[PDB]
Design an enzyme around this catalytic site. Structure first.
Site, short mmCIF file in Angstrom:
data_model
loop_
_atom_site.label_atom_id
_atom_site.label_comp_id
_atom_site.label_asym_id
_atom_site.label_seq_id
_atom_site.Cartn_x
_atom_site.Cartn_y
_atom_site.Cartn_z
N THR B 14 0.82 -1.20 0.00
CA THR B 14 0.00 0.00 0.00
C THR B 14 0.87 1.27 0.00
O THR B 14 2.13 1.22 0.14
CB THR B 14 -0.86 -0.05 1.23
OG1 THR B 14 -1.81 1.01 1.13
CG2 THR B 14 -0.02 0.29 2.47
N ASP B 127 -7.74 -7.34 7.75
CA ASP B 127 -6.72 -7.82 6.85
C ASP B 127 -5.52 -8.41 7.60
O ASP B 127 -4.37 -8.16 7.28
CB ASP B 127 -6.28 -6.68 5.95
CG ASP B 127 -5.60 -7.15 4.68
OD1 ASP B 127 -5.98 -8.26 4.20
OD2 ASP B 127 -4.70 -6.45 4.11
N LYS B 129 -2.87 -11.19 8.27
CA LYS B 129 -2.24 -12.23 7.47
C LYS B 129 -0.75 -12.16 7.69
O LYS B 129 -0.22 -11.09 7.96
CB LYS B 129 -2.56 -12.03 5.99
CG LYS B 129 -2.52 -10.59 5.49
CD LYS B 129 -2.35 -10.49 3.98
CE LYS B 129 -3.28 -9.42 3.36
NZ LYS B 129 -2.80 -8.81 2.08
N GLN B 131 1.96 -11.94 6.33
CA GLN B 131 2.77 -10.91 5.71
C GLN B 131 2.47 -9.52 6.24
O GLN B 131 3.10 -8.57 5.81
CB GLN B 131 2.53 -10.89 4.20
CG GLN B 131 1.53 -11.95 3.73
CD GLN B 131 1.24 -11.79 2.25
OE1 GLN B 131 1.98 -12.34 1.41
NE2 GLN B 131 0.22 -10.99 1.92
N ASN B 132 1.47 -9.38 7.11
CA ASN B 132 1.20 -8.11 7.78
C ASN B 132 1.46 -8.18 9.29
O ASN B 132 0.92 -7.39 10.05
CB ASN B 132 -0.27 -7.67 7.60
CG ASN B 132 -0.56 -7.05 6.22
OD1 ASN B 132 0.30 -6.97 5.33
ND2 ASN B 132 -1.81 -6.64 6.03
#
EC number: 2.7.11.22
Lengths: 258, 296, 5
Positions: B14, B127, B129, B131-132
């Site tokens: 983002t 959101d 996950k 990877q976050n």
């Protein structure tokens, strides 16, 4: 899940004091006036019907304008710009997909350029230091509603109505926190439709005695009573639609039993 | 901006390009999010608006720290505590050996405190996950990237056609309910927990329906008894295949009895019954929790 | 809608 209310409520009741506008700001403002402010919020109520925005977007947008004008003097000619960048920020914070800027420049009749609107968004942002998660009447109305035995969608529709009315006039209303306005609106909606009274359930949750509600309740009664006569009508014309059970047609009670 | 020297780009997503960089004055190391900006035909993007405002209110050890915003005419910089990498790229490197049980429990326990702190400040993530999720070398994990995060003082209307991801998406959104809840964040946690354990993603759907059916194939096929209302939800179908609920020990072998127990409450179908983050923290599974440090 | 004030 009902594991998290209280904490949210408490916290909304905390955040609400820090996101507060100055109560006598319209009067330090050289050029603009409560009635200019009324015209503006009416127009924003109408902008939201055209673009089928959510009601929280309108509540949030007003908050920005009020916190904006408590430190920025504005000319009557740049107010509609200050209003437009509020509804765009609010839109961008709350709506799933907001209107384009073009649409926000169009709701205003090629008055301000798209660029002016955009770099007034940045200025709004700067002055509220990216504090947009403001608590609003609509937020507290929703958190109530849960305490509604038996459930009933005319109260809900009508309390929402009353609480938008209070967006229009800062004259009295800017000296009430959303938690009380919401409170006063929930009671008046409930007293108008069933005759019931602001329940003891949320006399404990909120710490709001009916008696403590009295003052803003009176104000929000008068406002109700006089609604059809008001200079602005965009809200009443919106709460005519059967999306709402035509709550706005219902007949005010000319007394409150207080 | 003059005080920050870009050292290298450590990822992105983002907004755009995110560099490690050090304050030339204090010496601190930070991640600069550098958001590009369309001053002519868009403005500040909704994700930036949300991230900054919500994070500005969430001060907490297991939630990535927003430090400063630097807001010039054509550029918008965000300044974050540095962390060393993401759960996701950690697991690729630990896959083969496996992330050690004790570390995984520390991680779940920390994610459950930060998630809890988020939900008690009317904030969903929407959101979660691998990877976050950021890890440092001192064993801390923190929620990061609040771009799709929404405040829920009012209920959060759901996306027409959701933007969020497949693999960690709750069944109730896969059948097109009207609203999000704190429960979707939990369902996501319940998948990352599984993944860390078993080295592979619990439900790797290749499309909304496939994701359903993979779910259904493993925890059985929702009926009324388990989840009143499912039959009558916009995207639910009489023609759905009928599978049988597998033993969880079949699904996540390595875990012990109490971890299976809790994994299962995070994956319960009815949102109204799925466990809240608060409870989770109260769960037996966390009694012997330590703070191991990872081999990065 | 220009708002004239």
């Amino acid at each position: 899940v009902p594991d998290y209310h209280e904490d949210i409520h408490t916290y909304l009741r905390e955040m609400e004091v820090k996101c507060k506008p100055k109560v006598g700001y319209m009067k330090k403002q050289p050029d603009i006036t409560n009635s200019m402010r009324a015209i503006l919020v009416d127009w924003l109520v109408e902008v939201g019907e055209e673009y089928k925005l959510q009601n929280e977007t309108l509540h949030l947008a007003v908050n920005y304008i009020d916190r904006f004008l408590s430190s920025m003097s504005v000319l009557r000619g740049k107010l509609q710009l200050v209003g437009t960048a509020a509804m765009l920020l609010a839109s961008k914070f709350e709506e799933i997909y907001p209107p384009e800027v073009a649409e926000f420049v169009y709701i205003t009749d090629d008055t301000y350029t798209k660029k002016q609107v955009l770099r007034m968004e940045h200025l709004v942002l700067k002055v509220l230091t990216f504090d947009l998660a403001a608590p609003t009447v609509n937020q507290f109305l929703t958190q109530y509603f849960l305490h509604q035995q038996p459930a009933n969608c005319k109260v809900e529709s009508l309390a929402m109505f009353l609480g938008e009315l209070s967006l229009i006039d800062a004259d009295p209303y800017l000296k009430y926190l959303p938690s009380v306005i919401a409170g006063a609106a929930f009671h008046l909606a409930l007293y108008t439709v069933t005759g019931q009274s602001w329940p003891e359930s949320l006399i404990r949750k909120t710490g709001y005695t009916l008696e403590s509600l009295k003052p803003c309740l009176m104000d929000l009664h008068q406002t109700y009573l006089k609604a059809p006569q008001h200079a602005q009508q965009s809200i009443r014309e919106k709460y005519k639609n059967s999306k709402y059970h035509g709550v706005s047609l219902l007949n005010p009670p000319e007394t409150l039993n207080l | 901006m003059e005080n920050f020297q870009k050292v290298e780009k450590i990822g992105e997503g983002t907004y755009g390009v995110v560099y490690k960089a050090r304050n030339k004055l204090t010496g601190e190391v930070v991640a600069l999010k550098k958001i590009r900006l369309d001053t002519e035909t868009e403005g500040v993007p909704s994700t930036a608006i949300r991230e900054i405002s919500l994070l500005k209110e969430l001060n907490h050890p297991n939630i990535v720290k927003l430090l400063d915003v630097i807001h010039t005419e054509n550029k918008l910089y965000l300044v974050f505590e540095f962390l060393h990498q993401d759960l996701k790229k950690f697991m690729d490197a630990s896959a083969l050996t496996g992330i050690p049980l004790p570390l995984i429990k520390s991680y779940l326990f920390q994610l459950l405190q930060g998630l809890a702190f988020c939900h008690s400040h009317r904030v969903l993530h929407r959101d979660l996950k691998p990877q976050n999720l950021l890890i440092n070398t001192e064993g801390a994990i923190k929620l990061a990237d609040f771009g799709l995060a929404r405040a829920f003082g009012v209920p959060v209307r759901t996306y027409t056609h959701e933007v969020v991801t497949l693999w960690y998406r709750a069944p109730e959104i896969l059948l097109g309910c009207k609203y999000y809840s704190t429960a979707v964040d939990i369902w996501s946690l319940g998948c990352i927990f599984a993944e860390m354990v078993t080295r592979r993603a619990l439900f790797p759907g290749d499309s909304e329906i496939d994701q359903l059916f993979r779910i259904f194939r493993t925890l059985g096929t929702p009926d009324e008894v388990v989840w009143p209302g499912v039959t009558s939800m916009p995207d639910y179908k009489p023609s759905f295949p009928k599978w049988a609920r597998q033993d969880f020990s079949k699904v996540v072998p390595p875990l012990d009895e109490d971890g299976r127990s809790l994994l299962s409450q995070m994956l319960h179908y009815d949102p109204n019954k799925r466990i809240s983050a608060k409870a989770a923290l109260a769960h037996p599974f966390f009694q012997d929790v330590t703070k191991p440090v990872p081999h990065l | 809608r220009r708002l004239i004030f």
